[PDB]
Design an enzyme around this catalytic site. Sequence first.
Site, mmCIF file in Angstrom:
data_model
loop_
_atom_site.group_PDB
_atom_site.id
_atom_site.type_symbol
_atom_site.label_atom_id
_atom_site.label_comp_id
_atom_site.label_asym_id
_atom_site.label_seq_id
_atom_site.Cartn_x
_atom_site.Cartn_y
_atom_site.Cartn_z
ATOM 1 N N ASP A 185 0.909 -1.142 0.216
ATOM 2 C CA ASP A 185 -0.003 -0.055 0.070
ATOM 3 C C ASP A 185 0.740 1.278 0.002
ATOM 4 O OD1 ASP A 185 -2.453 1.601 0.130
ATOM 5 O OD2 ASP A 185 -2.670 1.422 2.377
ATOM 6 N N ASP A 190 3.078 3.545 7.316
ATOM 7 C CA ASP A 190 1.609 2.814 6.801
ATOM 8 C C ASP A 190 0.883 3.115 7.850
ATOM 9 O OD1 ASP A 190 -0.219 1.362 5.723
ATOM 10 O OD2 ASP A 190 0.732 -0.500 6.616
HETATM 11 C C1 LIG Z 1 -0.337 4.391 12.157
HETATM 12 C C2 LIG Z 1 1.229 4.773 12.415
HETATM 13 C C3 LIG Z 1 1.270 5.285 13.877
HETATM 14 C C4 LIG Z 1 1.914 3.533 12.157
HETATM 15 O O1 LIG Z 1 1.843 2.562 13.016
HETATM 16 N N1 LIG Z 1 2.898 3.867 11.382
HETATM 17 C C5 LIG Z 1 3.662 2.889 10.521
HETATM 18 C C6 LIG Z 1 5.115 3.373 10.175
HETATM 19 C C7 LIG Z 1 6.166 2.415 9.634
HETATM 20 C C8 LIG Z 1 5.655 0.953 9.422
HETATM 21 S S1 LIG Z 1 6.784 -0.010 8.611
HETATM 22 O O2 LIG Z 1 8.235 0.351 9.116
HETATM 23 O O3 LIG Z 1 6.054 -1.346 8.780
HETATM 24 C C9 LIG Z 1 6.725 0.523 6.880
HETATM 25 F F1 LIG Z 1 7.517 -0.423 6.094
HETATM 26 F F2 LIG Z 1 5.403 0.355 6.340
HETATM 27 F F3 LIG Z 1 7.256 1.598 6.542
HETATM 28 C C10 LIG Z 1 4.362 0.661 9.705
HETATM 29 C C11 LIG Z 1 3.479 1.525 10.465
HETATM 30 C C12 LIG Z 1 2.501 5.074 10.764
HETATM 31 O O4 LIG Z 1 3.262 5.638 9.552
HETATM 32 N N2 LIG Z 1 1.743 5.787 11.451
HETATM 33 C C13 LIG Z 1 1.187 7.009 11.256
HETATM 34 C C14 LIG Z 1 2.248 8.145 11.723
HETATM 35 C C15 LIG Z 1 3.435 7.811 12.276
HETATM 36 C C16 LIG Z 1 4.195 9.012 12.541
HETATM 37 N N3 LIG Z 1 4.031 10.367 12.758
HETATM 38 C C17 LIG Z 1 2.744 10.516 12.372
HETATM 39 C C18 LIG Z 1 2.183 11.647 12.200
HETATM 40 C C19 LIG Z 1 0.998 12.145 11.917
HETATM 41 C C20 LIG Z 1 0.199 11.024 11.243
HETATM 42 C C21 LIG Z 1 0.495 9.849 11.348
HETATM 43 C C22 LIG Z 1 1.737 9.429 11.863
#
Ligand SMILES: CC1(C)C(=O)N(c2ccc(S(=O)(=O)C(F)(F)F)cc2)C(=O)N1Cc1ccnc2ccccc12
Length: 277
Positions: free
Chosen positions: A142, A160
């Site tokens: 995604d 994500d």
């Molecule tokens: C939902 C939440 C918290 C989360 O769990 N992840 C996340 C990040 C990396 C991976 S991962 O390493 O598996 C790969 F490969 F996908 F990148 C998997 C999930 C986000 O990005 N998120 C959103 C988020 C995060 C930080 N700052 C935000 C500020 C504003 C709005 C949203 C924010």
Amino acid sequence: VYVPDEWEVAREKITMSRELGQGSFGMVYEGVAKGVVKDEPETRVAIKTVNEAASMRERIEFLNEASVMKEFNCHHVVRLLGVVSQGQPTLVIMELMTRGDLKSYLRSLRPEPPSLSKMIQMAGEIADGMAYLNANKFVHRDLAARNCMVAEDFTVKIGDFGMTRDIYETDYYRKGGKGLLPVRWMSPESLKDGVFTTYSDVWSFGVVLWEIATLAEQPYQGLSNEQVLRFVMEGGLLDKPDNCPDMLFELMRMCWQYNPKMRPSFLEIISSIKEEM
Ligand SMILES: CC1(C)C(=O)N(c2ccc(S(=O)(=O)C(F)(F)F)cc2)C(=O)N1Cc1ccnc2ccccc12
Ligand code: NI
Ligand SMILES: [Zn+2]
């Protein structure tokens, strides 16, 4: 089953503030956390959570998706900071990306043209994170601008935020009435056969480059979800965006080779932008 480790931090040390949006398993929040970063008594964090009313094996599914991030150490992938498996609700704490998702960030620039330089920066910063993930044997499935995240300094990181935000309901189709699909961002082979690979991640990257160049318009605006399927599976492509630099549309094309084995690697994409600085 999940076994806690040294990543575990205590519920006490975590504050929640205003909400960031609806996650796959629960609501997501802004917060502060203590003793999670070296020489830094307080740290702003994204608190991902679960609904008390979700299954035990969905609380297990939730944690084992955070266990994947424990392995990673790339400044262009959003950093895992800690876990709270003990008690209710179950939490994960992450690096807070203070300008939110690349799609809102690009949309906030319409009513004000960004430079080829800046668009190629962003492009290289996405391709770095993805190169790392592809190499740690992770297929995003995604990748889209709404799943990239922007830091106070405007640096982009792969993240994500799941398929569940009201805000981007247009960007998903329940095909055959099954699960949500980001059909506008999907490779022909993802659409036909359900084949997700590095190479299908490179297709989604082509559409992210389109999103940056258009300031996050809807890909194939004016086709229905079923019409997008037909169009892309029969070899259709997005149009050159208005005012699109040559170098950036040619990247796009490369990433949209029908034959997956014809698209370039993120490694090759990085090499390709690097001979442009
Ligand atoms: C939902 C939440 C918290 C989360 O769990 N992840 C996340 C990040 C990396 C991976 S991962 O390493 O598996 C790969 F490969 F996908 F990148 C998997 C999930 C986000 O990005 N998120 C959103 C988020 C995060 C930080 N700052 C935000 C500020 C504003 C709005 C949203 C924010
Ligand atoms: Ni960098
Ligand atoms: Zn499940």
